[PDB]
Design a protein around this nucleic acid. Structure first.
Ligand SMILES: [K+]
Ligand SMILES: [Mg+2]
Ligand SMILES: [Mg+2]
Ligand SMILES: [Mg+2]
Ligand SMILES: [Mg+2]
Ligand SMILES: [Mg+2]
Ligand SMILES: [Mg+2]
Ligand SMILES: [Mg+2]
Ligand SMILES: [Mg+2]
Ligand SMILES: [Mg+2]
Ligand SMILES: [Mg+2]
Ligand SMILES: [Mg+2]
Ligand SMILES: [Mg+2]
Ligand SMILES: [Mg+2]
Ligand SMILES: [Mg+2]
Ligand SMILES: [Mg+2]
Ligand SMILES: [Mg+2]
Ligand SMILES: [Mg+2]
Ligand SMILES: [Mg+2]
Ligand SMILES: [Mg+2]
Ligand SMILES: [Mg+2]
Ligand SMILES: [Mg+2]
Ligand SMILES: [Mg+2]
Ligand SMILES: [Mg+2]
Ligand SMILES: [Mg+2]
Ligand code: NA
Lengths: 225, 135, 33, 103, 66
RNA sequence: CAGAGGUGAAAUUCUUAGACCGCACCAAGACGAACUACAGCGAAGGCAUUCUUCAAGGAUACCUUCCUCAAUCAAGAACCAAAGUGUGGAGAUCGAAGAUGAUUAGAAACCAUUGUAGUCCACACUGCAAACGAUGACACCCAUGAAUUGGGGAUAUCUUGAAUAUCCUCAGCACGUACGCGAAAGCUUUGAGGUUACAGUCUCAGGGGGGAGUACGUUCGCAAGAGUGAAACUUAAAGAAAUUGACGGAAUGGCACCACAAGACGUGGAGCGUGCGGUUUAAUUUGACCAACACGG
């Protein structure tokens, strides 16, 4: 039988998320020289942000989060932030025709290694009394907005740790600061970060991961019924 | 064979519904995608080639998937829909809706639904000549 | 549609015919030379 | 005999020379992007009855939370636009009618 | 087993030859059932009108709209 | 873990030696979606990710400089999509040739699965496109309304200079509804207007249809070919724009048991009556071939 040899595991998000034991998964029992933890490390789990942070509102329901498995602790899968992304439906819905769609790619390495690429997207809007048939932006203002966004993100994220950077991205205080400080250049209908990807990780630390998770909830999977 | 949770707790999988205009895939995995629980397709349910993309084959496949995943222990399903995508059609095949409805009706809880057909930000040349498919 | 009545075959294929004819005449004369 | 003042395309004589083609959504035929028939489609993933059945089984979706839609910019060659009835031949007087918004 | 359905409206004759009728049918079930007041679109052959009754061999298939 | 692919339906093809599908990756080569528009830039051919860099180009602003330096063209010169050529490179995708499977009366096609050359890059050739606005360049006059791109000038909103508002202005791509023109379709400050009331300037080409952009010569080209370019002979039209019919395996709205659907009886199979035709005969008198054949009562 196929599933008679399967064992259940808990995936544990880092401590800066409220729902610690999001998701569940199976794996082959260790058998021979093939150890379960040695194929479990490196698996990437995707979850809706609204599921992870229940206390968050409707905007959280449009953002997905991916976590990679650093270490196996019994039946818990300790994880580190891997990537974050807006869902396809929301990003597709944000597009209008008669406006400029300005995208910025920002690459920043956190204070503890952890290079990340930010992929910011913004849109022009008409003003309140504007009668024009379009709100296209001049190229100089687009380049200036891109330069400002690059500077702000690099400055804010190179200073902090990976966990605090994740908290800034998930509680979208960084995007709020960006729209507040970028609107004087061009009136913006929306400025949101559509995807964040960890592109380079530092060498594996045990103490850093144990400090990323705080109080690790127990896994009951190994116990008997 | 299920996880050791209390009765009625929602244990989630992800279902990958791949409905082309030639076939329909109903594929349940965990939330990492790595481990597959069950995969039933329309061609597993019908005799004729012309019938695998149909809503009835898709519904039968979804019924099989629910039947097996109830003994897996999975009882809730996040949903990933896709058309063929890439440089081919982005419109889902006829069987996506029927498979999802049969999943919902047969007793599975539905979580997040998302459409994940591969979209290029720029592409290789698509099949056919510059004249297209000439019927 | 998109065009009026030609005198005979499609003009592009008539031109291709005349091209093949010229190539053959050129080959013939290069043979005799 | 010139049927259209615009020659069936949005490319005035002194605007630009070449507009890169796209593949027809239906048949793949290459068509200049100005000339092709472009529609942006916002499509529900399920019809009303399937939507009701799925929402009944979902803790996520309901009256509070809408289900996702499909978004597609579809560009058609003229033959496929006519055949699928997204566009129809019109009487000579009605050919000049242009719609700027979705109706 | 066959469920009994009540035709609540005739949506119109479908098909190329006009021999099929598309109707909206409500599943006549006991109160407290999942299929109570449940409505479904079905293709029907034979002369039918509003408030007629059908014997649904299956209640999971809906007829494609016309 | 038992199918996947593909089609109108299939088959060619892939697959328990694990295909298809699923997640995260890796590599290589293309391409830069949505935003993308009767929008911008470019002499034309052409040109969409970001940042850094080189030279340019246009418009606008100016009480800057200057002082006829210009317009347009044989000769000559430079650029020129795709396909194609040579030498290196690349080779993901697609794909002339070809292969296999279908379809078909045949199918060297359309369709399916593939696949060489190609498709991409550097360097050097070729110089042809419905290279189109089928509309040469420069200059003048010319009616109305709403717009749009860039720069200026003058005087409501939003963010904290940017953008927007009202008006005006120069330059640009255009749109709708005046003279006038036109064989008409149409064009109209974007002329095809200001022309028998025929003259601003320069320049290219045309003179019934074919033969034929063929032959011969010559120049260019590695070649493919490019440029120049007749005649004999043949023919009464060819051609253009509109009109009314007819037709369409175009769309739309209706309709009919000489249509179908649901059916009921039959006919076509047997014997026989009858009409028609063939054969026959001296003659087998003739008409008629849905709308002829128990019809010419
Ligand atoms: K020549
Ligand atoms: Mg604008
Ligand atoms: Mg056809
Ligand atoms: Mg025609
Ligand atoms: Mg015509
Ligand atoms: Mg002509
Ligand atoms: Mg055209
Ligand atoms: Mg231009
Ligand atoms: Mg061109
Ligand atoms: Mg068009
Ligand atoms: Mg198949
Ligand atoms: Mg394998
Ligand atoms: Mg494959
Ligand atoms: Mg882009
Ligand atoms: Mg080339
Ligand atoms: Mg070539
Ligand atoms: Mg290749
Ligand atoms: Mg190929
Ligand atoms: Mg044919
Ligand atoms: Mg082929
Ligand atoms: Mg002549
Ligand atoms: Mg008989
Ligand atoms: Mg007589
Ligand atoms: Mg007579
Ligand atoms: Mg009679
Ligand atoms: Na043209």
């Amino acid at each position: 039988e196929t599933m008679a040899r399967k064992e259940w595991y808990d995936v544990v998000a880092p401590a800066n998320f409220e729902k610690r034991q999001f998701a569940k998964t199976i794996c082959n029992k260790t058998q021979g020289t093939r150890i379960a933890a040695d194929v479990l490390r490196g698996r990437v789990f995707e979850a809706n942000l609204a599921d992870l942070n229940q206390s968050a509102g409707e905007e959280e329901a449009y953002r997905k989060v991916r976590f990679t498995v650093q270490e196996v602790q019994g039946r818990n899968l300790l994880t580190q932030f891997h990537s974050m992304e807006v869902t396809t439906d929301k990003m597709a819905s944000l597009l209008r025709k008669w406006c400029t769609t300005m995208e910025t790619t920002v690459e920043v390495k956190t204070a503890d290694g952890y290079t990340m690429r930010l992929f910011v997207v913004a849109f022009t809007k008409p003003q309140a009394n504007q009668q024009s048939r379009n709100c296209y932006a001049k190229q100089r203002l687009v380049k200036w907005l891109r330069m400002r966004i690059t500077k702000m993100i690099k400055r804010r994220l190179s200073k902090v740790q990976i966990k605090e950077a994740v908290s800034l991205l998930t509680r979208n205080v960084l995007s709020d600061a960006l729209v507040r400080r970028c609107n004087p250049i061009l009136p913006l209908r929306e400025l949101r970060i559509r995807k964040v990807r960890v592109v380079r990780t530092p060498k594996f630390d045990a103490q850093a991961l144990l400090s990323a998770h705080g109080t690790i909830p127990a896994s009951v999977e190994a116990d008997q019924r | 064979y299920g996880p050791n949770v209390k009765k009625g707790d929602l244990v989630y999988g992800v279902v990958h519904i791949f409905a082309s205009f030639n076939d329909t895939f109903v594929h349940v995995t965990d939330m990492s995608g790595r481990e597959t629980y069950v995969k039933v397709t329309g061609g597993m349910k019908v005799k004729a080639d012309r019938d695998e993309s149909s809503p009835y084959a898709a519904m039968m496949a979804a019924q099989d998937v629910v039947a097996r995943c109830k003994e897996c222990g999975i009882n809730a399903l996040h949903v990933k829909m896709r058309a063929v995508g890439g440089v081919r059609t982005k419109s889902p095949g006829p069987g996506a809706q029927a498979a999802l409805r049969a999943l919902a009706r047969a007793g599975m809880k539905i979580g997040r639904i998302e459409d994940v057909t591969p979209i290029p930000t720029d592409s290789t040349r698509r099949k056919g000549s510059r004249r297209g498919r000439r019927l | 549609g998109t065009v009026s009545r030609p005198r005979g075959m499609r003009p592009k294929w008539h031109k291709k015919r005349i091209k093949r004819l010229k190539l053959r005449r050129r080959r013939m004369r290069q043979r005799s030379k | 005999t010139t049927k259209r003042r615009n020659h069936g395309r949005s490319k005035p004589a002194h605007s630009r020379g070449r507009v890169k083609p796209i593949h027809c959504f239906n048949c793949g035929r290459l068509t200049p992007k100005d000339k092709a028939v472009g529609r942006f489609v916002v499509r529900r993933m399920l019809d009303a009855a399937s939507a009701r059945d799925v929402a009944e089984a979902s803790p996520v979706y309901g009256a509070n939370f809408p289900m996702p839609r499909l978004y597609m910019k579809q560009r058609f060659c003229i033959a496929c636009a006519i055949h699928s009835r997204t566009v129809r031949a019109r009487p000579v007087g009605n050919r000049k009618i242009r719609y700027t918004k979705k109706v | 087993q066959a469920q009994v359905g009540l035709i609540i409206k005739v949506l119109g004759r479908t098909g190329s030859r006009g021999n099929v009728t598309q109707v909206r049918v409500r599943l006549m079930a006991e109160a407290g059932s999942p299929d109570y007041n449940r409505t479904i679109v079905r293709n029907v052959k034979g002369p039918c009108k509003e408030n007629d009754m059908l014997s649904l061999m299956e209640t999971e298939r809906e007829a494609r709209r016309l």
